[PDB]
Design a protein around this motif. Sequence first.
Motif, PDB file in Angstrom:
ATOM      1  N   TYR A   1      34.512  34.507  47.563  1.00 33.16           N
ATOM      2  CA  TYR A   1      33.817  34.567  46.274  1.00 33.16           C
ATOM      3  C   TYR A   1      33.063  35.887  46.035  1.00 33.16           C
ATOM      4  CZ  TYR A   1      35.646  29.921  46.140  1.00 33.16           C
ATOM      5  OH  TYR A   1      36.516  28.853  46.152  1.00 33.16           O
ATOM      6  N   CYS A   2      32.749  36.666  47.103  1.00 41.24           N
ATOM      7  CA  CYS A   2      32.205  38.029  46.921  1.00 41.24           C
ATOM      8  C   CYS A   2      33.331  38.975  46.455  1.00 41.24           C
ATOM      9  CB  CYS A   2      31.502  38.556  48.168  1.00 41.24           C
ATOM     10  SG  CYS A   2      29.830  37.887  48.400  1.00 41.24           S
TER      11      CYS A   2
ATOM     12  N   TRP B   1      33.936  38.012  42.454  1.00 44.00           N
ATOM     13  CA  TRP B   1      32.965  38.481  41.477  1.00 44.00           C
ATOM     14  C   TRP B   1      32.260  39.791  41.762  1.00 44.00           C
ATOM     15  CZ3 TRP B   1      32.377  32.909  42.549  1.00 44.00           C
ATOM     16  CH2 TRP B   1      33.008  32.115  41.582  1.00 44.00           C
ATOM     17  N   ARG B   2      32.424  40.396  42.968  1.00 47.38           N
ATOM     18  CA  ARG B   2      31.708  41.641  43.233  1.00 47.38           C
ATOM     19  C   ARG B   2      32.547  42.784  43.788  1.00 47.38           C
ATOM     20  NH1 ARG B   2      25.586  41.590  45.221  1.00 47.38           N
ATOM     21  NH2 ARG B   2      25.965  43.704  44.418  1.00 47.38           N
ATOM     22  N   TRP B   3      33.230  42.596  44.936  1.00 46.34           N
ATOM     23  CA  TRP B   3      33.960  43.678  45.623  1.00 46.34           C
ATOM     24  C   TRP B   3      35.402  43.291  45.965  1.00 46.34           C
ATOM     25  CZ3 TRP B   3      29.211  41.924  48.077  1.00 46.34           C
ATOM     26  CH2 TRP B   3      28.076  42.654  47.696  1.00 46.34           C
ATOM     27  N   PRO B   4      36.430  43.581  45.074  1.00 49.44           N
ATOM     28  CA  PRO B   4      37.835  43.140  45.360  1.00 49.44           C
ATOM     29  C   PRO B   4      38.489  43.697  46.619  1.00 49.44           C
ATOM     30  CG  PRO B   4      37.577  43.669  43.031  1.00 49.44           C
ATOM     31  CD  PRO B   4      36.319  44.140  43.709  1.00 49.44           C
TER      32      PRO B   4
ATOM     33  N   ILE C   1      27.551  30.366  48.726  1.00 50.07           N
ATOM     34  CA  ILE C   1      28.655  31.172  48.213  1.00 50.07           C
ATOM     35  C   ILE C   1      28.261  32.038  46.991  1.00 50.07           C
ATOM     36  CG2 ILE C   1      30.494  29.834  49.287  1.00 50.07           C
ATOM     37  CD1 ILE C   1      29.433  29.338  45.547  1.00 50.07           C
ATOM     38  N   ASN C   2      26.941  32.083  46.620  1.00 51.68           N
ATOM     39  CA  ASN C   2      26.355  32.921  45.563  1.00 51.68           C
ATOM     40  C   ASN C   2      26.550  34.414  45.966  1.00 51.68           C
ATOM     41  OD1 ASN C   2      24.521  34.311  43.740  1.00 51.68           O
ATOM     42  ND2 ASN C   2      22.952  32.756  43.972  1.00 51.68           N
TER      43      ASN C   2
ATOM     44  N   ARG D   1      26.713  44.416  50.594  1.00 51.35           N
ATOM     45  CA  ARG D   1      27.829  45.070  51.251  1.00 51.35           C
ATOM     46  C   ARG D   1      27.311  46.122  52.213  1.00 51.35           C
ATOM     47  NH1 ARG D   1      33.596  47.235  48.726  1.00 51.35           N
ATOM     48  NH2 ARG D   1      34.642  47.362  50.761  1.00 51.35           N
ATOM     49  N   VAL D   2      27.822  46.095  53.442  1.00 46.02           N
ATOM     50  CA  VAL D   2      27.431  47.032  54.504  1.00 46.02           C
ATOM     51  C   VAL D   2      28.677  47.681  55.129  1.00 46.02           C
ATOM     52  CG1 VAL D   2      25.158  45.938  54.936  1.00 46.02           C
ATOM     53  CG2 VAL D   2      27.170  45.179  56.257  1.00 46.02           C
TER      54      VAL D   2
END
Lengths: 126, 131
Positions: B85-86, B89-92, B119-120, B126-127
Amino acid sequence: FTSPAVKRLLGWKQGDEEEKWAEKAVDSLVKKLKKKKGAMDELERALSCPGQPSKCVTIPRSLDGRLQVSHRKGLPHVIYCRVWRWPDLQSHHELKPLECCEFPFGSKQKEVCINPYHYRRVETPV
Amino acid sequence: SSLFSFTSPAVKRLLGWKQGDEEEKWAEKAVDSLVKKLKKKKGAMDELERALSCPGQPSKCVTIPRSLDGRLQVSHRKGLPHVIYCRVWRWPDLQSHHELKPLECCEFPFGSKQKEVCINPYHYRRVETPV
DNA sequence: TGCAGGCGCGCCTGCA
DNA sequence: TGCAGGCGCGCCTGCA
DNA sequence: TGCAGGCGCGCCTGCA
DNA sequence: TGCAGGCGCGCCTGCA
Ligand SMILES: [Zn+2]
Ligand SMILES: [Zn+2]
């Protein structure tokens, strides 16, 4: 099918680098077709009703055949058949022109037809 | 309606005829799988929509039950649900769980070893993957 | 109330 | 020790 | 001998 | 009229 809540959430989904590239490729084509009378119109007809026969939608041909969009190269009939018909299209070896096409890639003419409905999907030779 | 984010009405029209690849189709299946889970919990769907609508505002945990190996299966594919889910909605291009760290705001982070996993995507950062 | 089919979590093996 | 994928029993829905 | 990728000159637009 | 930068086709090399 899909519930209205799922569609809503999907609108927040981030498109990968290939999807972003495909938008760049579509924009590149629109700058070319906007210059020819009826070209944008003919392509939209072809895309909207796949069952009805359409006319050629052509762009100029480069010496090696390849087209460059935002630092990437490919063959323009493969590029636009991937966009509107088969995202998993491997190469030009998987495409064959239909009889209706007067400017198919391979016919070695000044212009190349990029109408995805003027080509058919085939198996790559062994 | 921006400088860089802007698409012309002609491109927008043509893009509507675009076919989504097998990863995009899979991501819709993954979102649908999550909605069947969250619709069962009071306020869960609402908190998720809130989290995604306004990324600048703090949101609460949006959790799903945890499996024995941590993995989740959606339409014959397995992965870790916070990575899944990251990516959506955030990093493909998110590689693995090694590229993720939980923010202090998160009560149910992956790795906390609790019944439920959050899962929010806004409860993780991201690291760089350790060498 | 019997079928019938679809799919995921928990199991398993196969590497390095 | 970690990952990665494959498949079946127990669950589920959809009919009549 | 086909691909595949990298980069520069000649083109283009956007200011003042 | 001048600058300043952006990007693609035609060139190039590097494999097999
Ligand atoms: Zn044609
Ligand atoms: Zn959380």
